[PDB]
Amino acid sequence: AILLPVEGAQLSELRQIPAEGGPVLHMLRLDSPQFSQFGEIYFSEVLPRRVKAWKRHSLMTQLFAVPVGCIHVVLYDGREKSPTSGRLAQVTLGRPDNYRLLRIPPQVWYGFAATGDTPALVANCTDIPHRQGESERAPQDAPFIPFSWAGADLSGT
Amino acid sequence: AILLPVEGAQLSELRQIPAEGGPVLHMLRLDSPQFSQFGEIYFSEVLPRRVKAWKRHSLMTQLFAVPVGCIHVVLYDGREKSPTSGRLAQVTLGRPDNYRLLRIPPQVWYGFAATGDTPALVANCTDIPHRQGESERAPQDAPFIPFSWAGADLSGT
Numbered sequence: 001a002i003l004l005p006v007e008g009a010q011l012s013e014l015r016q017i018p019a020e021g022g023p024v025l026h027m028l029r030l031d032s033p034q035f036s037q038f039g040e041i042y043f044s045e046v047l048p049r050r051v052k053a054w055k056r057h058s059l060m061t062q063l064f065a066v067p068v069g070c071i072h073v074v075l076y077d078g079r080e081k082s083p084t085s086g087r088l089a090q091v092t093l094g095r096p097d098n099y100r101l102l103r104i105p106p107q108v109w110y111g112f113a114a115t116g117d118t119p120a121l122v123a124n125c126t127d128i129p130h131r132q133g134e135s136e137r138a139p140q141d142a143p144f145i146p147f148s149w150a151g152a153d154l155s156g157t
Numbered sequence: 158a159i160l161l162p163v164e165g166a167q168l169s170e171l172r173q174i175p176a177e178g179g180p181v182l183h184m185l186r187l188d189s190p191q192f193s194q195f196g197e198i199y200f201s202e203v204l205p206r207r208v209k210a211w212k213r214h215s216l217m218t219q220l221f222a223v224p225v226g227c228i229h230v231v232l233y234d235g236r237e238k239s240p241t242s243g244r245l246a247q248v249t250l251g252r253p254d255n256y257r258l259l260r261i262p263p264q265v266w267y268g269f270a271a272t273g274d275t276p277a278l279v280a281n282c283t284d285i286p287h288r289q290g291e292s293e294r295a296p297q298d299a300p301f302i303p304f305s306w307a308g309a310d311l312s313g314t
Contacts, residue, residue: 021209022202022276029197029286038195040186041282043224045179052178067200068225068278119179121225121278125198129186 001034001103006077006089008105010034014065016099025099027065028125034063034101039128043121046071046114051149053111053140060134061127062104064112069120070094070156073102074147076109088147094120109138109145115156158191158260163234163246165262167191171222173256182256184222185282191220191258196285200278203228203271208306210268210297217291218284219261221269226277227251227313230259231304233266245304251277266295266302272313 001012012034017024028035039060046052046069056078064073075089092098092115104110114120128134140149158169169191174181185192196217203209203226213235221230232246249255249272261267271277285291297306 019209021207021271022204025200025202027198027200030195031286038187041184041198041280043182043184043280045182045224047179050178052176067202114178123198123200123280129188 004075004089004091005084005087006075006108007082007084009075009089009108010103011091012101014099014101025067027101027123028063034103036061037127039126040130041123041125043123046112046120046122048114048117048119049154051111051113051140053149054109054138054142054145055111056109056136057106058134059106059128061106062110063125064093064102064104065123066093066120067123069118070098070115071112071120071122072115072152072154073110073112075104076145076147078109079107111140111149113149113152113154115154161232161246161248162241162244163232163265164239164241166232166246166265167260168248169258171256171258182224184258184280185220191260193218194284196283197287198280198282200280203269203277203279205271205274205276206311208268208270208297210306211266211295211299211302212268213266213293214263215291216263216285218263219267220282221250221259221261222280223250223277224280226275227272228269228277228279229272229309229311230267230269232261233302233304235266236264268297268306270306270309270311272311
């Protein structure tokens with residue numbers, strides 16, 4: 001796994017198995033080094049050039065895969081006691097050259113947007129299920145999160 | 158959950174949460190009545206009008222969701238001692254009116270194909286991870302499995 005400029009954030013390879021009719025795309029196994037605990041599996045559709053930002057969880061860890069389309073993810077370390085406090089991590093997720101698993105640790109702000117001209121499908125396998133009050137949001141232009149979505153290049157070009 | 162003409166095969170509702178940028182699509186939680194055990198989560202892309210058939214597992218149970226596109230699934234009960242031995246179950250999976258979770262029990266043959274003119278993305282959350290020798294295949298035209306994919310209407314119309 002590749003470490004990112006935000007402490008605890010990791011990027012790992014996901015296998016695409018070629019097959020007639022279309023490929024098989026891995027995500028996570030019980031024995032995967034990246035697997036910890038099963039909480040929930042859900043999907044998030046992101047229409048092209050649309051932004052979903054910003055989110056933060058108190059305890060939950062995210063495991064993102066993007067089997068359809070392409071997204072730009074931005075991570076912001078708001079953890080006061082983190083050795084990478086105040087830093088950003090920017091990652092591109094999607095086929096065919098960026099099909100990886102992104103680990104987002106708790107208390108790290110995240111946002112993402114679909115690039116190009118077709119929708120993205122983000123899959124998330126979380127370690128705990130969704131529960132009221134365990135997560136926090138901020139407007140996508142929150143001035144305390146040092147990244148401008150309005151300024152982002154979502155052309156995918 | 159809706160029972161199907163093949164014993165043990167079930168169909169359950171999956172929530173689509175509306176949201177700006179695109180909806181959130183549920184699949185499975187730890188407390189879901191349909192959850193048993195976490196083995197693996199993978200995806201299968203099916204190009205339009207393409208068929209992936211036939212498969213059978215000795216112990217494994219399948220939990221299919223189709224968050225992108227649309228597929229036609231056919232189930233065939235080859236279990237000699239099943240009260241629905243020899244029967245077929247046909248199901249349509251996909252948004253927006255057929256976004257459900259399909260449970261395929263072990264030792265039931267399955268096949269599926271993408272309808273329409275855009276690809277499908279099938280998600281599968283299995284109770285055990287993939288392992289050599291635990292599954293079996295048959296050509297998509299196997300004459301012992303009483304369904305003709307060649308004759309199927311995959312227009313999606």
